[PDB]
Amino acid sequence: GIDELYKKEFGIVAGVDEAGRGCLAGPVVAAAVVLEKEIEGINDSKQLSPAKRERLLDEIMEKAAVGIGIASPEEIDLYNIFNATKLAMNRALENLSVKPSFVLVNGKGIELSVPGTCLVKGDQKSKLIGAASIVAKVFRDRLMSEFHRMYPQFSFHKHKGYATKEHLNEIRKNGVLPIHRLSFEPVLELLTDDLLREFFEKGLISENRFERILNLLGARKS
DNA sequence: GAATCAGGTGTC
Ligand SMILES: [Mg+2]
Ligand SMILES: [Mg+2]
């Protein structure tokens, strides 16, 4: 209903949502979705089991136009998680072949390159947002599972990079990676000067990133 | 699903 009201006043409306904000590693992912057919059981990604998201997605990729955007750990560290989130969302809109005239964005305080309105608890007031939320979450979880294959010593396929007990265990035993968000507190506290310079020297992080984290490290514990 | 315990950073 909410969507339809907006659909009638503005025309083609996309719903936008993001996954991965609170993570310690990996990109933030956003999805933009325009959907005209119905998909029963569309609802905030959190109130669904992984398996339900799985099949709810299959249907989405068949009945809807979808654009996916990501912002990297480097961009998070340089721009901050909020600006990086808006970047990913704008990238999602760009990758949507159906160019919307209005956007329904999950949350608060976000102005994208397309006029729109933000909705607190948006992923459950709106089907479009609810569907984007599923797309982002599953797509991101795939990304993290595939980080598991790249860094066997990290159960990214389970904790999806969040600050779980085992993830921190893993960081302490194995070391911070370049895919960790080096500006995030628990990562920063385990990082050392030595390791940072090592990242840079091996070409694992850009000079700009190196410089910003070096200064944060300097300001640390103060 | 709901609870309740954990743990991240933006806005203003
Ligand atoms: Mg979400
Ligand atoms: Mg919510």
Residue numbers in the entry: 2 to 223
What is written in the article reporting this PDB entry?
Ribonucleases H are the only known enzymes that degrade the RNA strand of RNA/DNA hybrids in a sequence-nonspecific manner, and therefore are essential for DNA integrity. Type 1 enzymes hydrolyze all types of RNA/DNA hybrids but require at least four ribonucleotides embedded in a dsDNA sequence to cleave (Ohtani et al., 1999), while most type 2 enzymes can hydrolyze all types of hybrids including DNA-RNA1-DNA/DNA (Eder and Walder, 1991; Eder et al., 1993; Jeong et al., 2004; Ohtani et al., 1999, 2008). Tm-RNase H2 contains two domains—the N-terminal catalytic core adopts the RNase H fold. The nucleic acid substrate is bound in a groove on the surface of the protein which is formed between the catalytic and the C-terminal domains.
For the initial crystallization trials, we employed an inactive Tm-RNase H2 D107N protein. Tm-RNase H2 ΔC D107N underwent extensive crystallization experiments in the presence of RNA/DNA hybrids of various lengths and 12 bp dsDNA harboring a single ribonucleotide in one of the strands (DNA5-RNA1-DNA6/DNA12). Protein-nucleic acid complex crystals were obtained only for the latter substrate, and they grew in the presence of 0.3 M MgCl2. The complex structure was solved by molecular replacement method with the apo structure solved at JCSG as a search model and subsequent manual modeling of the nucleic acid. We call this structure 1R-Mg, and it was refined to 2.0 Å resolution. Ions A and C were also observed in structures of mutant Tm-RNase H2 D107N solved with Mg2+ (structure 1R-Mg), Mn2+ (structure 1R-Mn), and Ca2+ (data not shown), but metal ion B was missing in all these structures. Therefore, the lack of binding of ion B does not depend on its identity and is likely caused by D107N mutation. The 5′-phosphate of the ribonucleotide of the (5′)RNA-DNA(3′) junction is located at the active site of the enzyme in agreement with the cleavage preference. The aromatic ring of the tyrosine stacks with the deoxyribose ring of the deoxyribonucleotide at the +2 position (numbering relative to the scissile phosphate) and seems to push it up, leading to deformation of the nucleic acid backbone at the (5′)RNA-DNA(3′) junction located between positions +1 and +2. The nonbridging oxygen-metal ion distance is 3.3 Å for Mn2+ ion versus 2.4 Å for Mg2+.
